[PDB]
Amino acid sequence: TGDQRFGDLVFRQLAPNVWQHTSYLDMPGFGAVASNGLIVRDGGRVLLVDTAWTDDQTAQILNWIKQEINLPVALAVVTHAHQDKMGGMDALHAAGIATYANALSNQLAPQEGLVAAQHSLTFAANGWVEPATAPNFGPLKVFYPGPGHTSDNITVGIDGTDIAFGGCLIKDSKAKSLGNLGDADTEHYAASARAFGAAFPKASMIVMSHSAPDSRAAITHTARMADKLR
Ligand SMILES: [K+]
Ligand SMILES: [Zn+2]
Ligand SMILES: [Zn+2]
């Protein structure tokens, strides 16, 4: 209740200027797998965090934004090189939206069959984005917590809100497993999850890629699950 639908996309307002977008991918015999990203209104422009699974779904996000917010989308940041986060890059570029990703995400994108972002983010030794690579990001605070779900995963806090986005690094606090595959770094995952928590220590709403928003318990639960794999 309260969620909005546009085509195959679902939108949930999380704060006066933040919405979660959800798109679905069918796994035959398994049903639809959800993927979440964020939409942020910053003054007279919109900033996008992650695409949908496909170009067509990403176009649905852009059309919902035009219809319900009616402000130009200035830039998009994508949080790693998997289809649920970068599958719609072509639709962003066609719309004239400037796209940003971790340099490593852009390097990985071709071998994954994905389109790289136009701009590469780089990071200081303490994990915070180098500001020259993230110009005019407004309230978006971009942090690289270390290798976890993937080597390239990045995370984003929204200044002025209680919201931080853990991407696929953080799992639901009720998760029964981490879902780590070959590209997860299971030696460092627990520390990376805890580093995300420490980078956004006041965030009380933790948005993640594959479950509904949770409390900080998602961070501590994820780190505990990851402790078991070291
Ligand atoms: K591994
Ligand atoms: Zn992923
Ligand atoms: Zn994912």
CATH of the domain at 7: 3.60.15.10
Helix (H, G, I), strand (E, B) or coil at 101: strand
| Total tally of structural domains belonging to the chain | 1
CA of 201 to the centre of ligand 1 (A): 28
Q: Ligand 2 is a single-atom ion; what residues have CB below 5 A from it?
A: 82, 168
Between CA 162 and CA 214 the distance in angstroms is: 12
Task: Enumerate residues 6+ apart whose C-beta is below 8 A from 33.
Answer: 24, 25, 26, 27, 210
Which long-range CB contacts under 8 A does 95-98 form with residues at least 24 apart?
Answer: 95/59, 95/62, 97/48, 97/73, 98/74
> Rounded to the nearest whole angstrom, what is the distance from the C-alpha of residue 59 to the centroid of ligand 1?
34
Looking at all shown ligands, the one closest to residue 182's CA atom is: 1
For residue 139, the CA-to-ligand 3 centroid distance in Å is 24
Resolution (A): 1.6
User: Whose CA is closest to 168, among 63, 79, 86?
Assistant: 79
Domain range enclosing 113: 1-230
- Two tokens, residue 122: 């780089």
In this structure, which amino acid lies at residue 122?
Answer: T
- Give Cβ neighbours of residue 208 (< 8 Å, ≥ 6 apart): 36, 165, 166, 167, 168, 170, 171, 172, 214, 218
How many angstroms separate the CA atoms of 212 and 172, rounded?
A: 8
User: For residue 105, how far is its CA from the centre of ligand 3 (angstroms)?
Assistant: 14
Which ligand sits nearest to residue 184's alpha carbon? 1
Q: How many CA atoms lie within 13 A of 176 on its CB side?
A: 0
Per-state percent for the chain, helix, strand, coil, to nearest 5: 25, 30, 45
